[model samples]
Target: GSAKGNFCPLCDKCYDDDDYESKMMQCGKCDRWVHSKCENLSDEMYEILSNLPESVAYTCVNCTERH
Candidate 1:
């Protein structure tokens, strides 16, 4: 997967150069990804989202607003 070219929904920028640092969360609803920083998710919060047992959604803003 060329995550390098995929547009991060939050930042509205493609994952470009560098070590390709940081993390992104994908929303099932829109099938789009957003950056942790853009979502204001600290590393630990992101860790829990990915590590925990089916920890809810890392949903997109659009879907979130529907709530």
Candidate 2:
């Protein structure tokens, strides 16, 4: 299997630690990366998400209708 690195759907760039800490969120459904800024997530929301327990899963907007 091919291992894909973090990819931001907004900028279309693989994550390179430039935005490592608070700029990224993974889509639990498709397993893709979306920058918090790209998704217009507030800093407060991003922080809350960043601190969530590992068991939590976040689906990107694209995946929401399927749920």
Candidate 3:
């Protein structure tokens, strides 16, 4: 058996690290992965995070306060 790959809770898609780098973010709370595209992330935010992932922080939609 092989890895199905990282699943995106946002778009319900799977992603595997390959030729092109994955534009995904892991939730700080739930630890789930979501595609940047699926989240319609702000380029400035995404780019800043991309440039310094460990230095930055992110939380998924469900993890954040919805109510």
Candidate 4:
């Protein structure tokens, strides 16, 4: 299962220890691991998040008051 191969970036979750070192994406700002499906984000979104400034924080689009 991919779930077992993925990890969470905010320490909100993790797939497992083995997958932690191998498949997780390390956030540039927080340096935590994140799983795509776990965060409900696609690979494209991950790329965007990675390039964002540390001052910026990510919240779900549905959670935005601007919406």
Candidate 5:
């Protein structure tokens, strides 16, 4: 897969070049390093991030939605 497969769960679009930076992000749903948008966040999504269990797998909601 190219750099495009890495997707954002909140938005169903290919990740841009700016996302290539190494950084952690939390998903709104599963609360994983789902994106690089550490610019802003909500308390709810932050809770999901801190309490996320192991073995949840770092996958996007797009794939999860597909299943």
Candidate 6:
């Protein structure tokens, strides 16, 4: 069951009103939400990516042939 807001599609968990604040990103290809820590994203990269324009498309590893 998904919660009222900010559910991570990768983990099927609710992020809203959680004790541990979660950082998330959207997969451009799959249009799924992934926790920053759930994937292999480094803090630096995540920070850089978080600042990027919403128009930018970021594909997850699972969606790529390289994975």
Q: Which predicted model would earn the best lDDT?
A: 2
Report the lDDT tens digits of candidate 6 across residue range 1-67: 6543344545735544662466666778886666677676798887776787766776766675474
Error of 5 at 49 (Å): 11
- By TM-score rank, best first, the candidates go 1, 3, 2, 6, 4, 5
Please, what are the lDDT tens digits per residue for candidate 2 over residues 3-55? 55466655745545565464667888897777677778888877776788856
Locate the minimum summed-lDDT window of 10 residues in model 4.
58-67
Q: Which clashing pairs does model 6 show?
A: none
What residue runs in model 1 are displaced by over 4 Å at the alpha carbon?
A: 1-5, 14-22
- Which prediction has more favorable TM-score, 2 or 6? 2
TM-score of each: 0.63, 0.60, 0.61, 0.37, 0.28, 0.56
**Cα RMSD (angstroms) for every candidate in the order listed:** 3.3, 4.1, 3.9, 8.2, 6.7, 4.5
The reply for model 3, stretches above 4 Å from the true place, is 1-5, 14-20
- Candidate 6 is scored at a TM of 0.56
Off by over 4 Å in 6: 1-20
Candidate 5: list runs displaced more than 4 Å.
1-5, 12-15, 22-33, 36-56, 62-67
| Predictions in order: lDDT | 0.65, 0.69, 0.68, 0.52, 0.48, 0.64
Residue 32 lDDT in model 1? 65
Q: Which candidate comes out best when scored by TM-score?
A: 1
Given candidate 3, what's the lDDT at residue 32?
70
User: What's the lDDT for residue 54 in model 4?
Assistant: 54
lDDT of candidate 5 over 9-60, digit per residue (tens): 5552345455546344534455544554432455566557557774344444
lDDT, residue 57, candidate 2: 81
Report the CA-based lDDT of candidate 6 relative to the real structure.
Answer: 0.64
